[PDB]
Design a protein around this ligand. Structure first.
Ligand SMILES: *[C@@H]1O[C@H](CO)[C@@H](O)[C@H](O)[C@H]1NC(C)=O
Ligand SMILES: [Cl-]
Ligand SMILES: [Cl-]
Ligand SMILES: [Cl-]
Ligand SMILES: [Cu+2]
Length: 235
């Protein structure tokens, strides 16, 4: 159970974005229905009044929280992967539009899931803004908690993978458009009951065997990381 508070750009806090530049849902409940329109940008998908200005090559940091800013972030039970997608705003996230900029699942060296490292990062994970056409974009940050993912929601609605989905309105101003955005996948539509990484048993299956849901990360993606960029407690 987690939500996005706001974003940082190049290590500078853009301020509380809830219902302002984040299309915030009313609470931190997960989305579980893979076929639901709620998979696109969660349960209150509407245009919010601001869009955060960035340039290609900027570092865009999402900041998550549980109940209050810079708290326990997400229950340490909620092991799973993290991804970020982009689509043009014109789409409203409908159709084959979502392009993957970032994926982290299980790190063999540190023996840690993306979610474990997000807690250590005080809720902060980043992407580098790609060299796409200037204009208005949606960045969709997605955490998949796998603690009940031995079952499928479609078969047992009281279990299943849990999706914490947040859409940020981002305006890309300076970009030479040298890596124009390629075709995307649909949400809902990309994840189905047979997709690798949707049904998994984290209690019996080695985390080293976990494969995150496709699609693969776009070759045009400029970088990204789970790491604290800024100290919320200094405001
Ligand atoms: C899953 O979402 C689809 C599409 O909106 C809907 O028809 C179906 O009733 C949903 N399932 C549940 C259990 O609400
Ligand atoms: Cl749901
Ligand atoms: Cl960190
Ligand atoms: Cl980064
Ligand atoms: Cu939860």
């Amino acid at each position: 159970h987690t939500l996005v508070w706001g974003v940082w750009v190049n290590g500078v806090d853009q301020g509380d974005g809830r219902n302002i530049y984040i299309r915030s849902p009313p609470n931190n409940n997960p989305v579980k229905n893979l076929t639901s329109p709620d998979m696109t940008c969660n349960v209150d998908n509407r245009v919010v009044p601001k869009s955060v200005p960035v340039n290609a090559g900027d570092t865009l940091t999402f900041e998550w929280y549980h109940n209050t800013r810079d708290d326990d972030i997400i229950a340490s039970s909620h092991h799973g992967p993290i991804a970020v997608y982009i689509a043009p705003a014109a789409s409203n996230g409908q159709g084959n539009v979502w392009v993957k900029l970032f994926e982290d699942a299980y790190n063999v060296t540190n023996s840690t899931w993306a979610v474990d490292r997000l807690i250590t990062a005080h809720g902060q994970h980043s992407v580098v803004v790609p060299h796409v056409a200037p204009g208005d974009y949606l960045f969709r940050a997605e955490i998949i908690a796998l603690h009940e993912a031995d079952s499928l929601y479609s078969q047992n609605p009281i279990r299943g993978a849990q999706f914490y989905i947040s859409c940020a309105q981002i305006t890309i101003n300076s970009s030479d458009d040298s890596t124009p955005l390629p075709a995307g996948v649909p949400f809902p539509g990309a994840y189905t009951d047979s997709t690798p990484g949707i049904q998994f048993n984290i209690y019996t299956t080695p985390a080293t065997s976990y494969v995150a849901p496709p699609p693969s990360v776009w070759s045009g993606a400029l970088g990204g990381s789970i790491a604290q960029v800024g100290d919320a407690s200094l405001e």
